[PDB]
Amino acid sequence: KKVRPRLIAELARRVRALREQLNRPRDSQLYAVDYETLTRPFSGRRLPVRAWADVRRESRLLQLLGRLPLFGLGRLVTRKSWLWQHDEPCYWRLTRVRPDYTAQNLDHGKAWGILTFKGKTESEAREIEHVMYHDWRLVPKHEEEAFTAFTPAPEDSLASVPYPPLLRAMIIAERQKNGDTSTEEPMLNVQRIRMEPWDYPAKQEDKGRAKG
Amino acid sequence: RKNKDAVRRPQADPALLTPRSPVVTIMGHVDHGKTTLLDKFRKTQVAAVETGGITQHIGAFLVSLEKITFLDTPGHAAFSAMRARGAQVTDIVVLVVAAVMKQTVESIQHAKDAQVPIILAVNKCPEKVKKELLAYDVVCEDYGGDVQAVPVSALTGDNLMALAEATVALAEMLELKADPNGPVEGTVIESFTDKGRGLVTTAIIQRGTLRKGSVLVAGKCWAKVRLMFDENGKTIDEAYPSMPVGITGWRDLPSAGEEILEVESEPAREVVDWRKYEQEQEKGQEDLKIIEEKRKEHNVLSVIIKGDVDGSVEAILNIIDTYDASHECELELVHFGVGDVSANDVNLAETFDGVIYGFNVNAGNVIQQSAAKKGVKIKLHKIIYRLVEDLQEELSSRLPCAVEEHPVGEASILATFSVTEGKKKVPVAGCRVQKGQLEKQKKFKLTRNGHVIWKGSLTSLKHHKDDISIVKTGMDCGLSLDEDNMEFQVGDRIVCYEEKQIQAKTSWDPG
RNA sequence: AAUAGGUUUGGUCCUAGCCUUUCUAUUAGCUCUUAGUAAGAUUACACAUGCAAGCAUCCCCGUUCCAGUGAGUUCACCCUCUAAAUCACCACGAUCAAAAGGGACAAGCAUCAAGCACGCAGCAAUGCAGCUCAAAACGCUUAGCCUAGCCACACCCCCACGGGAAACAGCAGUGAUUAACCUUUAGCAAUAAACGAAAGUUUAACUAAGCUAUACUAACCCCAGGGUUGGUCAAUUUCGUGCCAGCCACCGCGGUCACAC
RNA sequence: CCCCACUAUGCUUAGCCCUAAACCUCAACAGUUAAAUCAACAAAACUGCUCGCCAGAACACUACGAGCCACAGCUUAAAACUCAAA
RNA sequence: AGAGGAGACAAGUCGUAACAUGGUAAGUGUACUGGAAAGUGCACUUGGACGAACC
Numbered sequence A: 001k002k003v004r005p006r007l008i009a010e011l012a013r014r015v016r017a018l019r020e021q022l023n024r025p026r027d028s029q030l031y032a033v034d035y036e037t038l039t040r041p042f043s044g045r046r047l048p049v050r051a052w053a054d055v056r057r058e059s060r061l062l063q064l065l066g067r068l069p070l071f072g073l074g075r076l077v078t079r080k081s082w083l084w085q086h087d088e089p090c091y092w093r094l095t096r097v098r099p100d101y102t103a104q105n106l107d108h109g110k111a112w113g114i115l116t117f118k119g120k121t122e123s124e125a126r127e128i129e130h131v132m133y134h135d136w137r138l139v140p141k142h143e144e145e146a147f148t149a150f151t152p153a154p155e156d157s158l159a160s161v162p163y164p165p166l167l168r169a170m171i172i173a174e175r176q177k178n179g180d181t182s183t184e185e186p187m188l189n190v191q192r193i194r195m196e197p198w199d200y201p202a203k204q205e206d207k208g209r210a211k212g
Numbered sequence B: 001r002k003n004k005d006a007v008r009r010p011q012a013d014p015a016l017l018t019p020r021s022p023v024v025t026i027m028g029h030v031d032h033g034k035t036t037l038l039d040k041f042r043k044t045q046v047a048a049v050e051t052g053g054i055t056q057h058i059g060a061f062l063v064s065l066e067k068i069t070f071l072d073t074p075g076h077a078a079f080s081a082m083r084a085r086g087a088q089v090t091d092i093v094v095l096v097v098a099a100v101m102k103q104t105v106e107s108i109q110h111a112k113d114a115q116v117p118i119i120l121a122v123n124k125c126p127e128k129v130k131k132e133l134l135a136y137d138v139v140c141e142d143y144g145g146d147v148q149a150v151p152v153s154a155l156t157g158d159n160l161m162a163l164a165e166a167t168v169a170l171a172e173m174l175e176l177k178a179d180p181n182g183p184v185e186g187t188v189i190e191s192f193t194d195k196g197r198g199l200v201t202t203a204i205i206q207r208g209t210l211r212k213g214s215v216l217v218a219g220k221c222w223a224k225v226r227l228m229f230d231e232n233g234k235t236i237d238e239a240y241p242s243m244p245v246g247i248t249g250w251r252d253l254p255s256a257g258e259e260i261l262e263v264e265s266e267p268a269r270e271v272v273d274w275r276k277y278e279q280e281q282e283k284g285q286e287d288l289k290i291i292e293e294k295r296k297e298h299n300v301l302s303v304i305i306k307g308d309v310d311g312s313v314e315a316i317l318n319i320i321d322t323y324d325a326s327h328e329c330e331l332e333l334v335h336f337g338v339g340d341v342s343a344n345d346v347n348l349a350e351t352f353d354g355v356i357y358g359f360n361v362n363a364g365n366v367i368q369q370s371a372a373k374k375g376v377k378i379k380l381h382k383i384i385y386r387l388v389e390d391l392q393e394e395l396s397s398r399l400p401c402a403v404e405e406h407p408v409g410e411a412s413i414l415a416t417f418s419v420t421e422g423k424k425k426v427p428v429a430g431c432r433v434q435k436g437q438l439e440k441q442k443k444f445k446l447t448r449n450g451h452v453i454w455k456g457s458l459t460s461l462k463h464h465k466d467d468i469s470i471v472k473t474g475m476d477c478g479l480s481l482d483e484d485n486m487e488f489q490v491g492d493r494i495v496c497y498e499e500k501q502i503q504a505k506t507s508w509d510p511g
Numbered sequence C: 001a002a003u004a005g006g007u008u009u010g011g012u013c014c015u016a017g018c019c020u021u022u023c024u025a026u027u028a029g030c031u032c033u034u035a036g037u038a039a040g041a042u043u044a045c046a047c048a049u050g051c052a053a054g055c056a057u058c059c060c061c062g063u064u065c066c067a068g069u070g071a072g073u074u075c076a077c078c079c080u081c082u083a084a085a086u087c088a089c090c091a092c093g094a095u096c097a098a099a100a101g102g103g104a105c106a107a108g109c110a111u112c113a114a115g116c117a118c119g120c121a122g123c124a125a126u127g128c129a130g131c132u133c134a135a136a137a138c139g140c141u142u143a144g145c146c147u148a149g150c151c152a153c154a155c156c157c158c159c160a161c162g163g164g165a166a167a168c169a170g171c172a173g174u175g176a177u178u179a180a181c182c183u184u185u186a187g188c189a190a191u192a193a194a195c196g197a198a199a200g201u202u203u204a205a206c207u208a209a210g211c212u213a214u215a216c217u218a219a220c221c222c223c224a225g226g227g228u229u230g231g232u233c234a235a236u237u238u239c240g241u242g243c244c245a246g247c248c249a250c251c252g253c254g255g256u257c258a259c260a261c
Numbered sequence D: 001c002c003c004c005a006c007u008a009u010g011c012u013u014a015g016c017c018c019u020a021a022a023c024c025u026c027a028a029c030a031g032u033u034a035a036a037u038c039a040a041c042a043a044a045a046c047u048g049c050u051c052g053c054c055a056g057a058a059c060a061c062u063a064c065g066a067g068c069c070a071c072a073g074c075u076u077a078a079a080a081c082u083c084a085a086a
Numbered sequence E: 001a002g003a004g005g006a007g008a009c010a011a012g013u014c015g016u017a018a019c020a021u022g023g024u025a026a027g028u029g030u031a032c033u034g035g036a037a038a039g040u041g042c043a044c045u046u047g048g049a050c051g052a053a054c055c
């Protein structure tokens, strides 16, 4: 019943782990893009069609941060997609920047900031996602006050919604069966269901990384 | 049994007839430039890329000058059937003669049998050739004959344009037309087994248009056309009349030269079954006769043959059947097949102590190791005459050694003595050596006035009471035989001889 | 083995083996009209060719799934503990389920009877000399299993850094091999999966087709073959054969009047 | 086979060998004669409990493996081919 | 691969070992001996008989 040990399996697993840790690719290697063919030479995968124009027009976050003192710590950065989708100020307040030293132009790396999406800031700074995207723009120092200027519109949102027909009927029948005679319509509380827009930035910390 | 056979369609209606390309077959003698001329026409070189520079296969190529279907027949005497098949399927025969040989005469006979026009190509350039052909019923236009003769130089590519012009003119005169619609009628040019594409047949379409999924029957075989390719391997979506095509999808490998007919659907099988039944009946009749002939009463070389194509196998089998030395050694054909040497061939050779001959086929390391383990001899050749020579060598090896008798000396008896030695009376012949010398080791024979009485070795050779091994000419010697029954007279003769074993070579000749 | 039957012998009784009768599956012979459905290489031997994994405003995610094979084989089930995953986010938990621990878990062979360290105590040093086994240890051979499905493998070296070498046990197909042999079809319209916020895109999964009497269902104005005919066991007239040719599942037949060829 | 002579041997001592138609071919223990007694013969038919053994004939008191002071041995002990019997 | 064994095939040859008291009753173990079944010694068995009052 005693399984014969499989030493080579563990040996190969450790060797693979060590090789991956030592030979891990850099951000510049991963996110390099051939603007003539719109492909990443690291893996030779074409970018999606809808991004093509952006790849040909906009710039990356580090592509802007590399031309600022201390790599732009404290500056405000926005995204073109946010500007085209939402009218309220959507941007990031930089708190830490880790550029990739292996990039000749130092136009790659990670960045951390406090997100202010549609006028609402976040209590803590966190890693900025979609840094490598050709979607970013820099808020001017003289325009920071004007751009961040936003009056919070009242949150005039609905509170409860009607139940689905069969569920409402079943709940009413259960009420009657248990003896309740209340005519109050069953309602579904949607206040706790905060509907974040699909372009709300996600937790870059939990996001994975491409393999080498 | 009801007749379910699929028969050739009746001759096409004149309205349905449509002009088609011509089928031209290049025939001639060994090394007369047929392959070189075809290479010049095809704009590609393949004569150089061959094993020994010998055409051992009949290949069909669609050349675009107009379009023609050129068939390269082998020039060797071995593949006679192959040449005949070309004559059977061709519309025009280009007879290539180097500046008349046996195979040229055979090709002329084949063309006469097929009733096909002949264009003479005097390669390596002529009047002597035409004058000789006058005897073989090939008359040139200079001699009032219909056959057009064109002197050409294939190596230098001279006068080939006029040769093509003459071919096109003859094709136009023939007015070759066929129905490009309806059930397909064609002929198999070759059949083989590709390890990736299965059983494949090189065929020529004679009537109708062949398409993927068409159900065909040829001999005892049938197919649902799976891939139609050309000489280059590229798939072709249609096969018009007078177009070579490699067809894949045969459930069984057809024999070369068998007609291919299209049928409505696979449940083809019935047709095949019927044909099989017919063959069985024929065999059964023969069997019955043989069986009745029995019932009224009441140095063995076994060869396996594995060839690349059925045509080459047929040629080798025809060569084998020309064996006439059965008395000295019996040549038994255990099994013949198409494809690389396989486990069944090795098992058959091991069972019958035979030898496998592989013509243009391979044998993997596993097969070779198995043959070595089982004592099987696989002999792979790429040239037919090399295989023939190897078979002749094996047959000669099977033959017993031939004893050569060389006379060494001759002695005439003079007197007969009776010597009492060991309580035994030994007759001793006093002999005088006349010509040559006598040796104890060499054998002797006794001659009585020309008759041969005894054959053997002396039990004791003694001269002047002394044993001497070799007695020179003129020396007296007393000779005693091991056989006491032999009687010695006054006028008997003795001839000494040396026997040497010599290698015996097979009397069979492949020609 | 049953509602049993034939067969030992000059005959009876008993014991006993063998075979018959029944139901499936595969292959072979002969034969075969159609429709629907189900099922479908012999082979862990080698593979030509075409396809089978993308999606998506770039990052990510997936390609670890589905699909396949049965080579190997008490990794499958129960309990304890608790990873990864889903419930947006903690769920101060639920579901699902790895590793680890305990238990249970195929067949034949004892002409496989000893294994040879297979145990315990101590924090450790180290000490004790034990542990399993005829209630089958140890070993050899065989085999996928306990089937809403599960286990194992993924060309071989159990593993796979590495080496051998260049991989269809994915689909269609082929070579070899075997008694054994499905199309080199179409579509993502349905469901499932992957991706996306989504319209949707992709999928040889799958769906809808193709071939095959392998099976079941149903029918046809016309269209029926195969086997058998001494007994078991339903059913033979006349010729020929002459212990020959031949037949038989068992008992047996055939030597000039054969219900058995 | 019958007659005569003699040896190993039969006997004693010390070790081995470990086999028999070693069979009363009828296992040990406890109990019954009630019946439905009971294939045949033999030495009547049975019940409870336990152990050992058996599963067509022949191959086969055999081969191989293993153990033994046994070395032409003893114990355990097969299989293949064959038959429709034994 | 030279050979040994078993079974079948079944001949011919040399005897007649077993089945009747099989003409020496048969057999077991064992030892020796023999062309062959087999013979003999020793002990054992009835899967033989001793005729079943006296005579």
Ligand SMILES: Nc1nc2c(ncn2[C@@H]2O[C@H](COP(=O)(O)OP(=O)(O)OP(=O)(O)O)[C@@H](O)[C@H]2O)c(=O)[nH]1
Residues within 6 Å of the ligand: B028, B029, B030, B031, B032, B033, B034, B035, B036, B047, B053, B054, B055, B073, B074, B075, B076, B123, B124, B125, B152, B153, B154, B155, B156, B157
């Ligand atoms: N002098 C001369 N030699 C030629 C000419 N054409 C061809 N040859 C040579 O003749 C030889 C012809 O033999 P092959 O090329 O094998 O053609 P073949 O006549 O079909 O011979 P097989 O294939 O064996 O039947 C070639 O090797 C050429 O070198 C020519 O026009 N002039």
Ligand SMILES: [Mg+2]
Residues within 6 Å of the ligand: B031, B032, B033, B034, B035, B036, B047, B053, B054, B055
């Ligand atoms: Mg040539």
Ligand SMILES: [Mg+2]
Residues within 6 Å of the ligand: none
């Ligand atoms: Mg298997």
Ligand SMILES: [Mg+2]
Residues within 6 Å of the ligand: C111, D064, D065, D078
């Ligand atoms: Mg044994």
Ligand SMILES: [Mg+2]
Residues within 6 Å of the ligand: C143
């Ligand atoms: Mg297995």
Ligand SMILES: [Mg+2]
Residues within 6 Å of the ligand: C155, C167
């Ligand atoms: Mg494979």
Ligand SMILES: [Mg+2]
Residues within 6 Å of the ligand: none
């Ligand atoms: Mg592996």
Ligand SMILES: [Mg+2]
Residues within 6 Å of the ligand: C168
């Ligand atoms: Mg496949």
Ligand SMILES: [Mg+2]
Residues within 6 Å of the ligand: none
């Ligand atoms: Mg095949």
Ligand SMILES: [Mg+2]
Residues within 6 Å of the ligand: C180
């Ligand atoms: Mg089948």
Ligand SMILES: [Mg+2]
Residues within 6 Å of the ligand: none
């Ligand atoms: Mg989703």
Ligand SMILES: [Mg+2]
Residues within 6 Å of the ligand: none
């Ligand atoms: Mg005496």
Ligand SMILES: [Mg+2]
Residues within 6 Å of the ligand: D011
């Ligand atoms: Mg005494």
Ligand SMILES: [Mg+2]
Residues within 6 Å of the ligand: D022, E044
């Ligand atoms: Mg006793």
Ligand SMILES: [Mg+2]
Residues within 6 Å of the ligand: D061
């Ligand atoms: Mg004994």
Ligand SMILES: [Mg+2]
Residues within 6 Å of the ligand: none
């Ligand atoms: Mg023994």
